[PDB]
Design a protein around this motif. Structure first.
Motif, PDB file in Angstrom:
ATOM      1  N   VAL A 237      56.725 -20.495  72.188  1.00 41.79           N
ATOM      2  CA  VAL A 237      55.733 -20.703  72.320  1.00 41.79           C
ATOM      3  C   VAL A 237      54.524 -20.889  70.658  1.00 41.79           C
ATOM      4  O   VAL A 237      55.366 -20.811  69.871  1.00 41.79           O
ATOM      5  CB  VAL A 237      54.314 -19.342  72.733  1.00 41.79           C
ATOM      6  N   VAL A 238      53.687 -22.341  70.906  1.00 43.32           N
ATOM      7  CA  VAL A 238      53.406 -22.594  69.388  1.00 43.32           C
ATOM      8  C   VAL A 238      52.042 -21.970  69.380  1.00 43.32           C
ATOM      9  O   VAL A 238      51.218 -21.371  69.739  1.00 43.32           O
ATOM     10  CB  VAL A 238      53.605 -24.637  68.790  1.00 43.32           C
ATOM     11  N   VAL A 239      51.366 -21.505  68.128  1.00 43.29           N
ATOM     12  CA  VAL A 239      50.238 -20.714  68.105  1.00 43.29           C
ATOM     13  C   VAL A 239      49.760 -21.098  66.541  1.00 43.29           C
ATOM     14  O   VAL A 239      50.383 -21.050  66.110  1.00 43.29           O
ATOM     15  CB  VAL A 239      50.265 -19.123  68.598  1.00 43.29           C
ATOM     16  N   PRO A 240      48.783 -22.167  66.371  1.00 41.82           N
ATOM     17  CA  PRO A 240      48.120 -23.534  65.380  1.00 41.82           C
ATOM     18  C   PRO A 240      46.854 -21.967  65.572  1.00 41.82           C
ATOM     19  O   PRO A 240      46.205 -21.047  66.534  1.00 41.82           O
ATOM     20  CB  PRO A 240      47.583 -24.209  66.425  1.00 41.82           C
ATOM     21  N   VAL A 241      46.257 -21.720  64.198  1.00 43.59           N
ATOM     22  CA  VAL A 241      45.928 -21.076  64.021  1.00 43.59           C
ATOM     23  C   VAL A 241      44.767 -21.092  63.225  1.00 43.59           C
ATOM     24  O   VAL A 241      44.514 -21.764  61.666  1.00 43.59           O
ATOM     25  CB  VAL A 241      46.090 -19.648  63.430  1.00 43.59           C
ATOM     26  N   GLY A 242      42.987 -21.181  62.883  1.00 44.53           N
ATOM     27  CA  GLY A 242      42.680 -20.958  61.780  1.00 44.53           C
ATOM     28  C   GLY A 242      40.769 -21.203  62.488  1.00 44.53           C
ATOM     29  O   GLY A 242      40.414 -20.100  62.454  1.00 44.53           O
ATOM     30  N   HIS A 243      40.123 -22.045  62.102  1.00 46.19           N
ATOM     31  CA  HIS A 243      39.137 -22.174  62.488  1.00 46.19           C
ATOM     32  C   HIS A 243      38.219 -22.902  63.759  1.00 46.19           C
ATOM     33  O   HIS A 243      38.704 -23.978  63.233  1.00 46.19           O
ATOM     34  CB  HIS A 243      37.500 -21.415  61.371  1.00 46.19           C
ATOM     35  N   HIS A 244      37.874 -22.818  64.710  1.00 43.92           N
ATOM     36  CA  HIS A 244      37.282 -23.685  65.833  1.00 43.92           C
ATOM     37  C   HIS A 244      36.368 -24.578  64.761  1.00 43.92           C
ATOM     38  O   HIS A 244      35.515 -24.545  63.565  1.00 43.92           O
ATOM     39  CB  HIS A 244      36.452 -23.314  66.979  1.00 43.92           C
ATOM     40  N   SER A 245      36.028 -26.153  65.374  1.00 44.50           N
ATOM     41  CA  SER A 245      35.190 -27.191  64.576  1.00 44.50           C
ATOM     42  C   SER A 245      33.754 -26.614  66.400  1.00 44.50           C
ATOM     43  O   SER A 245      34.141 -26.589  67.585  1.00 44.50           O
ATOM     44  CB  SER A 245      35.836 -28.663  64.949  1.00 44.50           C
ATOM     45  N   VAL A 246      32.961 -27.724  65.456  1.00 48.10           N
ATOM     46  CA  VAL A 246      32.275 -27.980  66.994  1.00 48.10           C
ATOM     47  C   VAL A 246      32.573 -28.740  67.876  1.00 48.10           C
ATOM     48  O   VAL A 246      31.993 -28.892  68.779  1.00 48.10           O
ATOM     49  CB  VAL A 246      31.138 -28.331  66.384  1.00 48.10           C
ATOM     50  N   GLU A 247      33.432 -29.874  67.743  1.00 46.92           N
ATOM     51  CA  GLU A 247      34.181 -30.220  68.935  1.00 46.92           C
ATOM     52  C   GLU A 247      35.353 -29.244  70.150  1.00 46.92           C
ATOM     53  O   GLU A 247      35.610 -30.106  70.794  1.00 46.92           O
ATOM     54  CB  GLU A 247      35.249 -31.429  68.593  1.00 46.92           C
ATOM     55  N   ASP A 248      35.675 -28.125  69.435  1.00 46.24           N
ATOM     56  CA  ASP A 248      35.813 -27.106  70.640  1.00 46.24           C
ATOM     57  C   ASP A 248      34.711 -26.997  71.519  1.00 46.24           C
ATOM     58  O   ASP A 248      34.062 -26.194  71.931  1.00 46.24           O
ATOM     59  CB  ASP A 248      36.640 -25.941  69.542  1.00 46.24           C
ATOM     60  N   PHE A 249      34.717 -27.416  72.810  1.00 47.41           N
ATOM     61  CA  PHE A 249      34.320 -27.931  74.276  1.00 47.41           C
ATOM     62  C   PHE A 249      34.899 -26.524  74.305  1.00 47.41           C
ATOM     63  O   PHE A 249      33.056 -25.345  75.373  1.00 47.41           O
ATOM     64  CB  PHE A 249      34.163 -29.120  74.752  1.00 47.41           C
ATOM     65  N   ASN A 250      35.248 -25.455  74.380  1.00 41.15           N
ATOM     66  CA  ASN A 250      35.888 -24.967  75.281  1.00 41.15           C
ATOM     67  C   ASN A 250      35.639 -23.295  74.131  1.00 41.15           C
ATOM     68  O   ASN A 250      35.229 -21.716  75.233  1.00 41.15           O
ATOM     69  CB  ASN A 250      37.252 -24.314  75.584  1.00 41.15           C
ATOM     70  N   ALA A 251      34.595 -23.377  72.941  1.00 35.47           N
ATOM     71  CA  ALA A 251      34.072 -22.449  71.871  1.00 35.47           C
ATOM     72  C   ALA A 251      33.070 -22.037  73.288  1.00 35.47           C
ATOM     73  O   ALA A 251      32.651 -20.261  72.865  1.00 35.47           O
ATOM     74  CB  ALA A 251      33.269 -22.503  70.980  1.00 35.47           C
ATOM     75  N   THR A 252      32.159 -22.467  73.436  1.00 39.16           N
ATOM     76  CA  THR A 252      30.617 -22.654  74.157  1.00 39.16           C
ATOM     77  C   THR A 252      30.834 -22.882  75.662  1.00 39.16           C
ATOM     78  O   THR A 252      29.420 -22.869  76.604  1.00 39.16           O
ATOM     79  CB  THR A 252      29.903 -23.316  73.831  1.00 39.16           C
TER      80      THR A 252
END
Ligand code: FMN
Ligand code: FMN
Ligand code: NIO
Ligand code: NIO
Lengths: 216, 216
Positions: B186-201
């Motif tokens: 499993v690969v797990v990128p970690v950080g902060h989402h951008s406004v282009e993360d459709f899944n955040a909302t």
């Protein structure tokens, strides 16, 4: 701080049989099981939450004889969760997930919905037909759920212990899981530790990062 | 509250490449990897933490072909963790765990230490010799770690995404894992989402508990 929690939690070796979860805590542990993430949101799982003494006894049958140290833990604890994995992946289960996503308003169009179902079919079929690993792959997702759960319950301030020391065959037959298409993997007694928990005051032990971890 | 966290976290579809982990956060995510529990405390795992442009690129090689939409996530994130499982278990690894426990002061006598080693051998040997499931069993523990990790990072207020959509064969060869006795899961990128993360909302979707959960 969630690090504090990670650094302080432990596998409880003995629970206080008189200490029960609050009604709210019993809600919370169910919420955690439900909202674990999973590959494709496939959620390939069933949970048995035993909170009656009759219920816990039925689970503890799986430890009678060879896992008897696990028996006390299963009977003493407030709540015992059996984590179960689906045995084969049925197209009914994939439909029920995508229809749930749709009901929750995750898809802007039917194009969006059909595309999600198609993607889910592609990977699911890849596990079953190609890699011949769909049981294993579904089980892995249940273990992910367990990891989520243990930290969650620890952060609620509850004691727990993951148990692979039980007879999956016995517990399956006790709840008729094989016939319903599940198999028990991990049992997680949850509650408050007793003075008999020797592990509550022992230091945590882990391999050093210079063995386990490469930074690039 | 950890339930808030469980209910609010999401799989990030796009990260903001300008938004790095603080040096403290980078230490915290390493702590979480190390202190995950595991059956027998066997910790049958290696982690790659990719934080350079070079390093993330090497990992992103794995999102060739069918896994293309993984690629962005691996390059744009601040930190990318590759979770690896030991391929077979060596008696050297069991020794190194019990010696670690001893150094940390978990055993009152040599009788205590010899009995812990022998218990670990018993269940470990059951997996390899009897059930022929030791690869799978070690991989299950890695997925438990992933579950612990995702919630942990979410409690730190960081975005992440678990990825099974990558080419384990490519990532293994890129890091010479087969030869060192590991395999990527499993690969797990970690950080902060951008406004282009459709899944955040988007709303979270899960099957209802009347399907997944039996109370006894
Ligand atoms: C999948 C799994 C199975 C385990 N099975 C048992 C068990 O059967 N009996 C037990 O006493 N502890 C069990 N443990 C607890 C581990 O020994 C423990 O997680 C490990 O020694 C690390 O210690 P900690 O949980 O106190 O940090 C299990 C752990 C995991 C993750
Ligand atoms: C083991 C694992 C593998 C996943 N792999 C991917 C992946 O390759 N790409 C992706 O975009 N999301 C991936 N997901 C994210 C899931 O689709 C997501 O966890 C699930 O839909 C539930 O949504 P949430 O994480 O926002 O609650 C993966 C999830 C898990 C647990
Ligand atoms: O959850 C996902 O979207 C997913 C899971 C496995 C492989 N590729 C994508
Ligand atoms: O970690 C343990 O104590 C354990 C693991 C597997 C089986 N029995 C015990």
């Amino acid at each position: 701080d969630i690090i504090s929690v990670a650094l302080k939690r432990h596998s409880t070796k003995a629970f206080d049989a008189s200490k029960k979860l609050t009604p709210e805590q019993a809600e919370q542990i169910k919420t955690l099981l439900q909202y674990s993430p999973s590959s494709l949101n496939s959620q390939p799982w069933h949970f048995i939450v035993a909170s009656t003494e009759e219920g816990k006894a039925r689970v503890a049958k799986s430890a009678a004889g060879n896992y008897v140290f696990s028996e006390r833990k299963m009977l003493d604890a407030s709540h015992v969760v059996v984590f179960c994995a689906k045995t084969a992946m049925d197209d009914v289960w994939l439909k029920l997930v995508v229809d749930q996503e749709d009901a929750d308003g995750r898809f802007a169009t039917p194009e969006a919905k059909a595309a999600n179902d198609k993607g889910r079919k592609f990977f699911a079929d890849m596990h079953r037909k190609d890699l011949h690993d769909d049981a294993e792959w579904m089980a892995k997702q249940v273990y992910l759920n367990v990891g989520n759960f243990l930290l969650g319950v620890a952060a609620l301030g509850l004691d727990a212990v993951p148990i692979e020391g039980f007879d999956a065959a016995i517990l399956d037959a006790e709840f008729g899981l094989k016939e319903k298409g599940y198999t028990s993997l991990v049992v997680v007694p949850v509650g408050h530790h007793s003075v008999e928990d020797f592990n509550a005051t022992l230091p945590k032990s882990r391999l050093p990062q210079n063995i386990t971890l490469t930074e690039v």
